[PDB]
Amino acid sequence: MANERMNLMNMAKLSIKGLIESALNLGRTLDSDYAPLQQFFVVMEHCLKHGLKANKSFWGPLELVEKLVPEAAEITASVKDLPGLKTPVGRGRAWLRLALMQKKLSEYMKALINKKELLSEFYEVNALMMEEEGAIIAGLLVGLNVIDANFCMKGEDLDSQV
């Protein structure tokens, strides 16, 4: 279990660094078609599912966030109202994308890992989010605050000068 954690963290380090470097080279707003970003969401999900106690999957832990950081209220509500979103895993995926758009993911993950008593309801004692790897990942996520992503309508696609 301690090895699976280290592998996931090394997987996260690589995805975070690749996303940041690639996005900076690209220079424009990112959306769902951006492969380095799709990789980040998948790795982040694998990290959040690790050591989950045997069902909201990783959505369970993400729900606690708004109680620790009020600002996460709006996106939490948004996902509970997303058109056709029917599964917890789906809500967890939409929540991650909106958090990345808000440039708030590091803040939300740091708030969670710092409340292991609450997290224990959802994770085993040796889960990534319950261990040191989880804390390193939350710190590494701060670099993603530079990412400009929009998973909805982009104003630049609609504008025209009269």
Swiss-Prot record:
It is found in: Cytoplasm; Endomembrane system; Cell projection, Invadopodium; Cell projection, Growth cone. Phosphorylated by PAK1. Isoform 1 is partially phosphorylated. Residues 31-156 form the RUN domain. Expressed in brain (at protein level). Interacts with PAK1. Interacts (via C-terminus) with Ras-related Rab-5 proteins. Interacts (via C-terminus) with Ras-related Rap-2 proteins. Interacts with PIK3CA and PIK3R1. Interacts (via N-terminus) with FSCN1; this interaction induces neuron axon development. Interacts with DBN1. Interacts (via the second coiled coil) with GTP-, but not GDP-bound ARL8A and ARL8B. Interacts with dynactin/DCTN1 and the dynein intermediate chain DYNC1I1/2. Directly interacts with DYNC1LI1. The second coiled coil domain is involved in the interaction with GTP-bound ARL8B. ARL8 effector that promotes the coupling of endolysosomes to dynein-dynactin for retrograde transport along microtubules. Acts by binding both GTP-bound ARL8 and dynein-dynactin. In nonneuronal cells, promotes concentration of endolysosomes in the juxtanuclear area. In hippocampal neurons, drives retrograde transport of endolysosomes from the axon to the soma. Plays a role in the generation of neuronal polarity formation and axon growth. Implicated in the formation of a single axon by developing neurons. This is Protein RUFY3. It comes from Mus musculus.
